[PDB]
Design an enzyme around this catalytic site. Structure first.
Site, mmCIF file in Angstrom:
data_model
loop_
_atom_site.group_PDB
_atom_site.id
_atom_site.type_symbol
_atom_site.label_atom_id
_atom_site.label_comp_id
_atom_site.label_asym_id
_atom_site.label_seq_id
_atom_site.Cartn_x
_atom_site.Cartn_y
_atom_site.Cartn_z
ATOM 1 N N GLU A 197 -4.856 -2.490 0.050
ATOM 2 C CA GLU A 197 -5.951 -1.547 0.233
ATOM 3 C C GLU A 197 -5.904 -0.417 -0.786
ATOM 4 O OE1 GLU A 197 -6.806 1.084 4.015
ATOM 5 O OE2 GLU A 197 -7.711 -0.893 4.318
ATOM 6 N N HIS B 142 -7.033 -7.946 7.799
ATOM 7 C CA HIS B 142 -7.088 -7.149 6.585
ATOM 8 C C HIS B 142 -8.290 -7.576 5.748
ATOM 9 C CE1 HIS B 142 -6.070 -5.380 2.704
ATOM 10 N NE2 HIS B 142 -5.177 -4.634 3.328
ATOM 11 N N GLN C 131 -5.381 -7.542 13.788
ATOM 12 C CA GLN C 131 -6.020 -6.899 12.648
ATOM 13 C C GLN C 131 -6.277 -7.909 11.538
ATOM 14 O OE1 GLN C 131 -4.055 -3.721 9.804
ATOM 15 N NE2 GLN C 131 -5.695 -2.751 10.995
ATOM 16 N N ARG D 111 -10.272 -0.747 8.842
ATOM 17 C CA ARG D 111 -10.170 -2.159 8.486
ATOM 18 C C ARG D 111 -11.026 -3.042 9.384
ATOM 19 N NH1 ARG D 111 -3.639 -2.786 7.338
ATOM 20 N NH2 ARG D 111 -3.613 -1.709 5.311
ATOM 21 N N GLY E 148 0.766 -1.232 0.000
ATOM 22 C CA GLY E 148 0.000 0.000 0.000
ATOM 23 C C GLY E 148 0.800 1.287 0.000
ATOM 24 N N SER F 132 1.980 1.378 9.514
ATOM 25 C CA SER F 132 3.004 0.491 10.059
ATOM 26 C C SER F 132 4.369 0.787 9.449
ATOM 27 C CB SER F 132 2.623 -0.970 9.829
ATOM 28 O OG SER F 132 3.603 -1.831 10.381
ATOM 29 N N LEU G 120 -1.942 -11.075 0.184
ATOM 30 C CA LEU G 120 -2.556 -9.769 0.363
ATOM 31 C C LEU G 120 -2.858 -9.109 -0.975
ATOM 32 C CD1 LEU G 120 -3.168 -7.458 2.608
ATOM 33 C CD2 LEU G 120 -1.158 -6.389 1.546
ATOM 34 N N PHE H 106 -6.412 6.117 1.324
ATOM 35 C CA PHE H 106 -6.348 4.900 2.120
ATOM 36 C C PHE H 106 -7.465 4.934 3.153
ATOM 37 C CE2 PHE H 106 -3.472 1.271 3.014
ATOM 38 C CZ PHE H 106 -2.948 1.106 1.749
ATOM 39 N N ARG I 183 -5.093 -0.406 13.603
ATOM 40 C CA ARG I 183 -4.103 0.369 12.871
ATOM 41 C C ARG I 183 -4.663 0.834 11.534
ATOM 42 N NH1 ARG I 183 -0.476 -0.790 8.769
ATOM 43 N NH2 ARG I 183 -1.013 -3.021 8.851
ATOM 44 N N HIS J 6 -3.502 -10.321 9.502
ATOM 45 C CA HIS J 6 -2.570 -9.475 8.772
ATOM 46 C C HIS J 6 -1.538 -8.824 9.684
ATOM 47 C CE1 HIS J 6 -1.023 -6.827 5.709
ATOM 48 N NE2 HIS J 6 -1.401 -5.752 6.378
HETATM 49 C C1 LIG Z 1 2.221 -9.001 5.854
HETATM 50 C C2 LIG Z 1 2.090 -7.606 5.298
HETATM 51 C C3 LIG Z 1 2.241 -6.501 6.132
HETATM 52 C C4 LIG Z 1 2.114 -5.219 5.610
HETATM 53 C C5 LIG Z 1 1.834 -5.024 4.230
HETATM 54 C C6 LIG Z 1 1.688 -6.138 3.407
HETATM 55 C C7 LIG Z 1 1.811 -7.422 3.927
HETATM 56 C C8 LIG Z 1 1.648 -8.625 3.030
HETATM 57 N N1 LIG Z 1 1.704 -3.786 3.689
HETATM 58 C C9 LIG Z 1 1.849 -2.714 4.471
HETATM 59 C C10 LIG Z 1 1.725 -1.419 3.936
HETATM 60 O O1 LIG Z 1 1.477 -1.285 2.718
HETATM 61 N N2 LIG Z 1 1.859 -0.328 4.690
HETATM 62 C C11 LIG Z 1 2.125 -0.493 5.997
HETATM 63 O O2 LIG Z 1 2.253 0.518 6.721
HETATM 64 N N3 LIG Z 1 2.252 -1.718 6.561
HETATM 65 C C12 LIG Z 1 2.124 -2.827 5.840
HETATM 66 N N4 LIG Z 1 2.255 -4.107 6.410
HETATM 67 C C13 LIG Z 1 2.555 -4.267 7.850
HETATM 68 C C14 LIG Z 1 4.041 -3.974 8.010
HETATM 69 O O3 LIG Z 1 4.701 -4.162 6.752
HETATM 70 C C15 LIG Z 1 4.724 -4.850 9.043
HETATM 71 O O4 LIG Z 1 4.124 -4.658 10.327
HETATM 72 C C16 LIG Z 1 6.194 -4.480 9.095
HETATM 73 O O5 LIG Z 1 6.781 -4.714 7.811
HETATM 74 C C17 LIG Z 1 6.977 -5.251 10.143
HETATM 75 O O6 LIG Z 1 8.306 -4.745 10.063
HETATM 76 P P1 LIG Z 1 9.415 -5.097 11.169
HETATM 77 O O7 LIG Z 1 10.720 -4.487 10.718
HETATM 78 O O8 LIG Z 1 8.860 -4.738 12.528
HETATM 79 O O9 LIG Z 1 9.549 -6.702 11.088
HETATM 80 P P2 LIG Z 1 9.639 -7.518 9.699
HETATM 81 O O10 LIG Z 1 9.825 -6.571 8.541
HETATM 82 O O11 LIG Z 1 8.519 -8.528 9.675
HETATM 83 O O12 LIG Z 1 11.018 -8.308 9.904
HETATM 84 C C18 LIG Z 1 11.293 -8.942 11.146
HETATM 85 C C19 LIG Z 1 12.793 -9.172 11.242
HETATM 86 O O13 LIG Z 1 13.098 -9.800 12.490
HETATM 87 C C20 LIG Z 1 14.041 -10.830 12.296
HETATM 88 N N5 LIG Z 1 13.825 -11.915 13.279
HETATM 89 C C21 LIG Z 1 12.647 -12.459 13.620
HETATM 90 N N6 LIG Z 1 12.852 -13.425 14.548
HETATM 91 C C22 LIG Z 1 14.180 -13.476 14.780
HETATM 92 C C23 LIG Z 1 15.043 -14.300 15.668
HETATM 93 N N7 LIG Z 1 14.520 -15.251 16.477
HETATM 94 N N8 LIG Z 1 16.376 -14.083 15.655
HETATM 95 C C24 LIG Z 1 16.834 -13.131 14.832
HETATM 96 N N9 LIG Z 1 16.134 -12.362 14.017
HETATM 97 C C25 LIG Z 1 14.790 -12.520 13.972
HETATM 98 C C26 LIG Z 1 13.847 -11.332 10.880
HETATM 99 O O14 LIG Z 1 15.101 -11.716 10.308
HETATM 100 C C27 LIG Z 1 13.277 -10.132 10.161
HETATM 101 O O15 LIG Z 1 14.302 -9.486 9.402
HETATM 102 O O1 LIG Z 2 -1.296 -3.137 6.270
HETATM 103 C C1 LIG Z 2 -1.176 -1.996 5.776
HETATM 104 O O2 LIG Z 2 -0.716 -1.043 6.438
HETATM 105 C C2 LIG Z 2 -1.667 -1.832 4.331
HETATM 106 C C3 LIG Z 2 -1.684 -2.962 3.562
HETATM 107 O O3 LIG Z 2 -1.113 -4.112 3.913
HETATM 108 C C4 LIG Z 2 -2.395 -2.886 2.214
HETATM 109 O O4 LIG Z 2 -1.804 -2.342 1.257
HETATM 110 O O5 LIG Z 2 -3.543 -3.366 2.108
#
Ligand SMILES: *Cc1cc2c(cc1C)nc1c(=O)[nH]c(=O)nc-1n2C[C@H](O)[C@H](O)[C@H](O)COP(=O)(O)OP(=O)(O)OC[C@H]1O[C@@H](n2cnc3c(N)ncnc32)[C@H](O)[C@@H]1O
Ligand SMILES: O=C([O-])CC(=O)C(=O)O
Ligand SMILES: CCCCCCCCCCCCCCCCCC(=O)OC[C@H](COP(=O)(O)OCCN)OC(=O)CCCCCCCCCCCCCCCCC
Ligand code: HEM
Ligand SMILES: CCCCCCCCCCCO[C@@H]1O[C@H](CO)[C@@H](O[C@H]2O[C@H](CO)[C@@H](O)[C@H](O)[C@H]2O)[C@H](O)[C@H]1O
Ligand SMILES: COc1[nH]c(=O)c(C(=O)[C@@H](C)C[C@H](C)[C@@H](Cl)CCl)c(O)c1OC
Ligand code: SF4
Ligand code: F3S
Ligand code: FES
Ligand SMILES: [K+]
Lengths: 240, 139, 611, 102
Positions: free
Chosen positions: C256, C243, C241, C287, C52, C403, C253, C120, C398, C354
């Site tokens: 949105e 989605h 949440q 959402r 998004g 995010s 996904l 959005f 959210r 989601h």
């Molecule tokens: C699933 C999703 C979420 C999403 C989205 C589309 C999808 C399919 N689109 C979004 C959007 O358009 N706009 C937005 O604001 N948010 C959107 N989201 C939600 C958002 O992307 C997520 O909440 C966010 O990306 C999470 O980011 P974060 O940096 O907090 O974590 P991550 O990117 O999932 O990566 C996690 C990292 O942690 C490391 N990890 C995990 N466990 C361990 C252990 N045990 N040891 C070491 N490292 C660990 C992973 O390697 C990973 O890099």
């Molecule tokens: O989760 C979000 O912040 C937005 C998202 O995945 C979407 O593009 O539908």
């Protein structure tokens, strides 16, 4: 009430002293399995052989973790459809000409290091204004990045290039080279000439002989072969 | 905090002394027409280059000149089917390497890189290779 | 039995997503010798799958104001969000997005050469009275892909010592202070202790606790479990949440942004039913409202497809040039995973897990907090940012594209708070020689597990229990049955059976360690849901369909008796787990209603929430 | 010069085009002008072509120099023998005509 599909998967275990590489056959009922090969690999690991090791994460073709050689060609297991022809056995190997850490997991450390060597980030000569106002870029100049920024670094293209097989130590490969081209033509980047001088050697760029296996195997539909040719055109025309 | 040069040196130093295997490649990868046509361009290139050097060495080391060996072949009165075999077999690699060489020069201008065009240009090279090899071998 | 390698840095980050990277090189940008521990290669993190965009009041499409984005986020959170953190996030939003674009992020462009922004869900102008807003900055529909690769490339310019394919096991706690993390090197099977004065947790969410989720297979909530095993609380874990438009089948996904560009939702009779559930916002409501609206349309008998278990997302009424320019990624995904041409036929979609609103409770500076005797006390040396953290800028719901903003805003905040609190090169805290041996003992036990329930079977029964007991609509009797079944599954973790006796890339053992983490998150999610007897945001109780605040904010406050703190629910849930027995203990802390400056940004009192 | 790699690539495409242009010149205007140009173009084009095969396939500092040194000797003798054939014998163009008359 079933549809037994055969998979022959490359196996190797660094924990067994004396284990030689081998192929193992698994039978999967396609009625109880998803449409993609990764669904079969996960189903096999969950139910048949939990020792089978492979990289996976997004299962949607965006992260690039599940790159492997399926039926002779490098592709993403999460977007590679299962061959429903139950007569043929799908043969699954790791990425070609790569050191195997375990089973289907190759060592991409050199692949990643080559991507770092080209400095893949925006570089301006007056970076004293970073974090003030958004850099201007026209829609037309932004369109020049279409086809280049969608690369997911799966290494399907680089591990399919024969020049990368013979000279992977000094030839960057189609993945890194296309990304180097992605920053050469970025209208916001000021180090375009410096990025070309880095390729003034017989190996980094000029090991590409336009074999074009890279474009055929790219699961993103990108064309690293055409981008390399655009680099070659820039190399012969730019002045210092 | 290691640079790319150190990561590359660490990669090779670690793996070349390990017991990890190199994943298969030649024996497992699926072939395609552009892939087979790229190596054939290399094969015909190596063949033509060494055939020119063999001809060049014969000029410096054979006791007779060219008009003599031309007369020797004519006196043997070889059949037309055998004469046509040697003419076609000698002009085929030159014909192929020439058409596929123009195709490589077209690539070097950045044209015809759509994968469907790569298959088209290859098939065009093959029919022009056969056409020009059959016409010249008939002269 | 395992060789131990000890490391010492000024700070250690656990995570390589948007938040982890931004905090990692942000610390090295401040001269801190920093390590970044991640179990995946940084560009494989779930952030790469974001589509998004990211919200910011840049004003590229119309006259905007960051205080309008503040109001949208506060109303979006249903007043469970801490307004001081929402103030900080929305005000820094223009600076964070500009910073990403200056890093080289190839945002979509407008005719003026500036960043393109789309509409959005739940975004308005003039404090909710000025019409639909357009503040979602996006790279077509591959925003998170371009955000993560830009941040990773940017991080290559700093002396950040990366540790890729390292699995963090637990925190090194001493006297209530975090001394670092202990981890397992997947490549060579060795145990590593990372000692540091400060530790940041950015490990993502735990969407894999359910059977159908848009999350990646690796989103297992490992940093949420490390906190729980350390004895520290987690916050608001029951707010999950859903989605609205998760593709039918694989759960992938569909952004949105499809609805932001003009896409609508239709039922079995072709009715744009969101005109009836939310006449103003329609398909661009919050959402939680859209997901509940789609659920009722299916449950009442107006589902689409053969089994009548989904609805349609219609995009073919839009010009094809706009689809190829604004939504190219979902156009290909809808073809691969659904065989749908978005220019001719709609997409089958249904609500899908989601995002996790809850997580590790922090303040607006990113510092992890504990709550003792009504006083928020900071945990010394522990930070959190991203989906793993509970600021809580999102409260009970959210807003889309917030995010990715949270990632870069509070990822940088952790680096800023450390740069002002501590100096680089200070004496690293000395841990006792046997610190972390209980994590190794747990790893070796699972490595030789030989019970009757294999890891794939225990993970499945958890996902099905969460899917049918803590779904969209919840009730007390169904939540209790899920709690009794989830506690039984947790007790049956002693019957675990594993087959891979290796230690090098033993994904059988790693997915079992992730199962231990998933169970801890799933327990607190459904136990916090069974206790919360109200309806707020995504937590909808069919037996307690009302939102219960300290006042009845649907009537004049004059002449109202304020409900005591233990008699209303406008408060965070604080969850604890005794990891031996699996007992869940629940506490509650007040919602921060004040902002960072009343003169600059007025606090929004709770009100009736509608779209 | 620091642009040696790109100038070598450009010089190759220049010789390949010239070598392609001498094939119609040999059929239309056979003579000593085309004979020595063919001897020059064939040698230079083949020398660089075999050098790319060596670069791709030969590894090791000593085997690389062993292969490249033998290529210079091969090309020098090849160019000397073609020029010997053009001055003391019938020439390249006349030879192909006599050969095809068989
Ligand atoms: C699933 C999703 C979420 C999403 C989205 C589309 C999808 C399919 N689109 C979004 C959007 O358009 N706009 C937005 O604001 N948010 C959107 N989201 C939600 C958002 O992307 C997520 O909440 C966010 O990306 C999470 O980011 P974060 O940096 O907090 O974590 P991550 O990117 O999932 O990566 C996690 C990292 O942690 C490391 N990890 C995990 N466990 C361990 C252990 N045990 N040891 C070491 N490292 C660990 C992973 O390697 C990973 O890099
Ligand atoms: O989760 C979000 O912040 C937005 C998202 O995945 C979407 O593009 O539908
Ligand atoms: C063992 C050696 C291996 C390597 C061999 C390949 C070497 C390639 C490099 C040399 C290429 C030189 C080609 C020169 C061809 C032209 C020379 C010539 O004048 O040939 C005339 C002959 C046609 O003669 P005619 O039909 O009488 O018409 C005359 C019109 N003016 O023309 C012809 O009809 C015959 C042309 C055939 C060309 C074959 C080239 C060699 C194979
Ligand atoms: C007589 C000829 C000889 C002896 C010869 C020799 C060679 C050789 C040995 C190569 C190396 C192939 C490789 O490294 O893959 C080569 C490449 C090439 N040849 Fe020729 N060639 C001849 C005629 C021609 C003609 C008439 C054209 C037009 C042509 C176009 C090319 C091109 C474009 C290449 C570049 C290959 C690449 O890009 O890798 N050649 N030639
Ligand atoms: C003298 C010189 C002769 C050079 C050529 C010699 C013959 C080479 C034969 C090798 C052909 O190998 C074959 O090539 C065809 C076309 O590329 C491939 O076909 C491929 O393209 C087709 C058409 O889009 C699709 O079915 C699909 O993408 C793929 O199968 C096929 O998978 C491969 O098995
Ligand atoms: C034009 O350059 C080239 N063109 C080629 O087709 C080529 C090749 O593809 C083969 C010779 C290599 C070998 C047979 C493996 Cl890769 C097939 Cl499974 C190759 O190695 C090469 O040199 C780098
Ligand atoms: S160019 Fe294509 S195949 Fe190569 S790394 Fe990028 S996405 Fe993968
Ligand atoms: S396959 Fe290899 S040779 Fe060049 S055109 Fe692609 S990088
Ligand atoms: S798993 Fe992400 S690309 Fe296949
Ligand atoms: K969260």
């Amino acid at each position: 009430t079933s549809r037994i599909k055969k998979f022959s998967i490359y196996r190797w275990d660094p924990d067994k002293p004396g284990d030689k590489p081998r192929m193992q056959t698994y039978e999967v009922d396609l009625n109880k399995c998803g449409p993609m090969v990764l669904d079969a690999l996960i189903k096999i690991k969950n139910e048949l052989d939990s020792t089978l090791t492979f990289r996976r994460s997004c299962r949607e073709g965006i992260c690039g973790s599940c790159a492997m050689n399926i039926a002779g060609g490098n592709t993403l297991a999460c977007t590679k459809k299962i061959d429903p022809d139950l007569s043929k056995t799908t043969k699954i190997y790791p990425l070609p000409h790569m050191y195997v850490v375990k089973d289907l997991v190759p060592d991409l450390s050199n692949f990643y290091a080559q991507y770092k060597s080209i400095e893949p980030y925006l570089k301006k000569k007056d970076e004293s204004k970073q974090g003030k106002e958004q850099y201007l870029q026209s829609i037309e100049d932004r369109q020049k990045l279409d086809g280049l920024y969608e690369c997911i670094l799966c290494a399907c293209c680089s591990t399919s290039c024969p020049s990368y097989w013979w000279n992977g130590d000094k030839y960057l490969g189609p993945a890194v080279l296309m990304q180097a081209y992605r920053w050469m033509i970025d209208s916001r980047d000021d180090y375009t000439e410096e990025r070309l001088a880095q390729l003034q050697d017989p190996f980094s760029l000029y090991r590409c002989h336009t074999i074009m296996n890279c474009t055929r195997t790219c699961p993103k539909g990108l064309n690293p072969g055409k981008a390399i040719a655009e680099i070659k055109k820039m190399m012969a025309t730019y002045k210092e | 905090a290691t640079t790319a040069k150190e990561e590359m040196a660490r990669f090779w130093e670690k793996n070349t002394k390990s017991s990890r295997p190199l994943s298969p490649h030649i024996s497992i990868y699926k072939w395609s027409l552009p892939m087979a046509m790229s190596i054939t361009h290399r094969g015909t290139g190596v063949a033509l280059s060494l055939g020119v050097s063999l001809f060049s060495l014969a000029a410096l080391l054979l006791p007779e000149q060219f008009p003599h060996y031309v007369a020797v072949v004519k006196s043997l009165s070889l059949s037309p089917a055998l004469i046509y075999s040697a003419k076609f077999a000698l002009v085929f690699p030159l014909s192929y390497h020439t058409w596929n060489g123009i195709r490589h020069l077209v690539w070097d201008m950045g044209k015809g890189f759509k994968l469907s065009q790569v298959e088209q240009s290859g098939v065009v090279v093959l029919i022009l290779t056969l056409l020009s090899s059959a016409a010249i071998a008939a002269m | 039995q395992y060789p131990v390698v000890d490391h010492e840095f000024d700070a250690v980050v656990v995570g390589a997503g948007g938040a982890g990277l931004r905090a990692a090189f942000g610390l090295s940008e401040a001269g801190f010798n920093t390590a970044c521990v991640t179990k995946l290669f940084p560009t494989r993190s779930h952030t790469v799958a974001a589509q998004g965009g990211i919200n910011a009041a840049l004003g590229n499409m119309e006259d905007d104001n960051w205080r309008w984005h503040f109001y949208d986020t506060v109303k979006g959170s249903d007043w469970l969000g801490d307004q001081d953190a929402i103030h900080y996030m929305t005000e820094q939003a223009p600076a964070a997005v500009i910073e990403l674009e200056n890093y080289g992020m190839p945002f979509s462009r407008t005719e003026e050469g500036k960043i393109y922004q789309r509409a959005f869900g739940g975004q308005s102008l003039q404090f909710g009275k000025g019409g639909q807003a357009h503040r979602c900055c996006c790279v077509a529909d591959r925003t998170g892909h371009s955000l993560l690769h830009t941040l990773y490339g940017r991080s290559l310019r700093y002396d950040t010592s990366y540790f890729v394919e390292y699995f963090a096991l637990d925190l090194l706690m001493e006297n209530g202070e975090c001394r670092g993390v202990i981890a397992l090197c997947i490549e060579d099977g060795t145990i590593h202790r990372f000692r540091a004065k400060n530790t940041v947790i950015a490990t993502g969410g735990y969407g894999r606790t359910y059977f159908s989720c848009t999350s990646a297979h690796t989103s297992t909530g490992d940093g949420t479990a490390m906190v729980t095993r350390a004895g520290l609380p987690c916050q608001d874990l029951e707010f999950v949440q859903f989605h609205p438009t998760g593709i039918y089948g694989a759960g992938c996904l569909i952004t949105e942004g499809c609805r932001g560009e003009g896409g609508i939702l239709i039922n079995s009779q072709g009715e744009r039913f969101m005109e009836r559930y939310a006449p103003v916002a329609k398909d661009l409501a919050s959402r939680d409202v859209v997901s509940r609206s789609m659920t009722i349309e299916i449950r009442e008998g107006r589902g689409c497809g053969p089994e009548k278990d989904h609805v349609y997302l219609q995009l073919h009424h839009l010009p094809p040039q706009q689809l190829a320019t604004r939504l190219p990624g979902i156009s290909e995904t809808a073809m691969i995973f659904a065989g749908v041409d978005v220019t001719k036929e709609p997409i089958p979609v249904l609500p899908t897990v989601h995002y996790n609103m809850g997580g590790i409770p922090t303040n607006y500076k990113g510092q992890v907090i504990t709550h003792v005797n009504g006083e928020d006390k900071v945990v010394p040396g522990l930070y959190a940012c991203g989906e793993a953290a509970s600021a809580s800028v999102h409260g009970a719901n959210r807003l889309g594209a917030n995010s990715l903003l949270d990632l870069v805003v509070f990822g940088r905040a952790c680096a800023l708070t450390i740069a002002e609190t501590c100096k680089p090169g200070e004496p690293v805290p000395s841990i006792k020689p046997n610190a972390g041996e209980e994590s190794v003992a747990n790893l070796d036990k699972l490595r030789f597990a030989d019970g009757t329930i294999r890891t794939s079977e225990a993970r499945l029964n958890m996902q099905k229990t969460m899917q049918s007991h803590a779904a969209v609509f919840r009730t007390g009797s169904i939540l209790q049955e899920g709690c009794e079944k989830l506690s039984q599954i947790y007790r049956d973790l002693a019957h675990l059976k594993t087959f891979d006796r290796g230690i090098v890339w033993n994904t059988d053992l790693v997915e079992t360690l992730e199962l231990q983490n998933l169970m801890l998150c799933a327990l607190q999610t459904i136990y916090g849901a069974e206790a919360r007897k109200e309806s707020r945001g995504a937590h909808a109780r069919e037996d307690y369909k009302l939102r219960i605040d300290e006042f009845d904010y649907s009537k004049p406050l004059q002449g109202q008796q304020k409900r005591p703190f233990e008699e209303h629910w406008r408060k965070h849930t604080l969850s604890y787990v005794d990891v031996k027995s699996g007992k869940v203990t629940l506490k509650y802390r007040p919602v921060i209603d004040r902002t960072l400056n009343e003169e600059d940004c007025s606090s929004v009192p709770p009100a009736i929430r509608s779209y | 010069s620091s642009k040696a790699a790109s100038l070598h690539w450009t010089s190759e495409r220049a010789v390949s085009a010239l070598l392609l242009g001498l094939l119609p010149a040999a059929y239309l205007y056979p003579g000593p002008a085309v004979d020595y140009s063919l001897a020059a173009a064939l040698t230079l084009h083949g020398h660089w072509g075999l050098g790319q095969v060596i670069t791709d396939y030969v590894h090791g500092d000593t085997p690389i120099k062993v292969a490249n040194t033998g290529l210079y000797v091969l090309s020098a003798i090849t160019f000397t023998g073609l020029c010997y054939f053009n001055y003391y014998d019938v020439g390249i163009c006349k030879a192909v005509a006599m050969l095809w008359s068989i």
